[PDB]
Subunit: 216 residues, 4 copies
């Protein structure tokens, strides 16, 4: 079902401060190694009048490398798949909710994303495109309400120095109740590997792996 | 442009905890008197697996009665119109973002809404449909970032007694720059006037008027 | 117990961004008319390195005028009195928690307050003293867990224009379970009537009255 | 100044939901190895009417083991020392702010803590004492405003199962500006190693170490 190498296609429909847009992409990676890349294209509403960085994390948790003793809830959910939703609370008031469906079709993962971002200050980092990528991050996960949940304290690097803080709250829901893991963590590092002048064509790379707390 | 009697058409595309649905409706009211009603039909995704109440407020401020000394930002925005976005933070973790466009076509207001609700507990008031309508409310508004903003501490009455709290944060954005008001308030009371057994056909009534603080 | 005219004494022990201070005051008013004034003096920690405005609201609801049909929980709590606590969430990260005890000693109300404020940006309106008093406000109250709770969307006027937003969450706890009101509101307007340059000596006036929603 | 072995004494003055209490203790540890213990005694307000767990993390970061390439801001602040403040946002509404001062005297660290906790549901995990200790955690830190800040997504284990979520927001302020680290993490695991029936006497052990993200 989930091969050593897997490709995926994604489509996002979103709005940010009243500006609607569409994005289509194709990616690939090694689900058991914790690596995956993706190439995106703004197919509608481009060039985007905000930082591409807020969208990069919405474009693969099935590719998270999991140790044998931590049930890989997301991988187990296939072939049916899972859905995930998320809240992004930015420190200057901006708020985003995301809903996504992940399925398996013709040997390829299919991602469907709906994005709504609101309340971003007009002179803030997002609308002024002053961000420079995310710092590597660490997610705290745990089972609840029959599904998997996780929170992350993330940060975008600012062009003029400093950080722009964003709290991530995600909900991973398998389409069939498969084995859930316990309290654990997932380290991720997402890099923008290429981009044209106006970010209408972008490529990303993500390394992500789950683990127990260094149990210090 | 804004007659004493105006009708409107509305369509909402939304998702709540991974459940997709569509709703279309028709309303009418008296913009200078602060009254307006609307009849809705769940055109897709019905019956809804959640409380209808969280949707009722996404279904009119151009109909808010305003004193002569308080600029009616929304009315002034027409014929072009305005967009409004919103964040609803529920006390039990549920979060929703909404983005809407309000326009005027041949004497009839046109509303287009996109709604995304996430993180609602499966045993909570919303997913268990234990709500019984909203209490009348009072929104605190003010100008900022060249637009109009307002927050509200609202509450849903619970069938088993008590209230279910929700904080509202809205942004009203005219499509063309117009006169903004100062720090003021808007009282509203929304009632569900009719509904079939599964809430696939619902009618609503809302009275809403703006005013200065009772200037105590 | 509660006469048409009542005086009170207050003492606050507080800390803000690592700065310790103490304040003592004396006030008076007409509990049944909704008016009361208070005079403060910074006895330790002066001059304060932050805006006085964040402290003014911690210095009386027993003086809130209530309609005969709305139980005046706070007045009913005496002679024993009541305790109140509160959270103030500032839009720029600043957070404050307050705990207070109100008693009646020799026909005089006695207020004991503890205050801890943290996370205020050193460049923010608070630490830079860029505020000019609060806008009149409106609190939303309701009963819960045997006590009375209330929330407010308040705002401080900024010297250079605009507002600085702060959300209030209060908990009023009678020392003995006395009668509680239903869902209602309380309007208030606090004004600094006098003060020296460094706010080591200040006088305040507050008008506050309870009521049902104007019911729109 | 900071030897391989160091003792400390601490005193806490706090209040929770109107209940006041005072705690005194003494601990010891190995600053460069990341190990430290502490023994507490509720000297006033005991037996506490709430879960001891919310207080345990308020009782040593100068004992965090740091790699040579990461400036140990907190150790460098001595002999004068540093102050730290914090906000703990509990998922059911509870909110706590803490302010603390850390100094070095006659070769012994001296800790003074003030604590105010409010808005805990009378039937919640805290007031019902339904918690069973913290899960090991991971704090995300970064420099800002000349000081060191960090956030943590923590969880308290529940007796009836599941977790009780709490977000930590801390600010570490050296009394003199000493070198700051960059974006990094601190792992910690605090265990209650001893306690009498009513938690009026308690002992704790904490292992905490700083490090760069596993830099995936």
């Amino acid at each position: 079902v989930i091969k050593e190498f897997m490709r995926f296609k994604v489509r996002m429909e979103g709005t940010v401060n009243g500006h609607e847009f569409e994005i289509e992409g194709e990616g690939e990676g090694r689900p058991y190694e914790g690596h995956n890349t993706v190439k995106l294209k703004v197919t509608k509403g481009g060039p985007l009048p905000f930082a591409w960085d807020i969208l990069s994390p919405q474009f693969s948790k099935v590719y998270v490398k999991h140790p044998a003793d931590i049930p890989d809830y997301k991988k187990l959910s296939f072939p049916e798949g899972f859905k995930w939703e998320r809240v992004m609370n930015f420190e200057d008031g901006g708020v985003v909710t995301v809903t996504q469906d992940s399925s398996l079709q013709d040997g390829c993962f299919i991602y469907k994303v709906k994005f709504i971002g609101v309340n971003f200050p007009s002179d803030g980092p997002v609308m002024q495109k002053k961000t420079m990528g995310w710092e590597a991050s660490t997610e705290r996960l745990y089972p609840r309400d029959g599904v998997l949940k996780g929170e992350i304290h993330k940060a975008l690097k600012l062009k003029d120095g400093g950080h722009y803080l964003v709290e991530f709250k995600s909900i991973y829901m398998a389409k069939k109740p498969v084995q859930l893991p316990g309290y654990y963590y997932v380290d991720s590092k997402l890099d923008i590997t290429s981009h044209n002048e106006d970010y209408t064509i972008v490529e990303q790379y993500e390394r992500t792996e789950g683990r127990h707390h260094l149990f210090l």
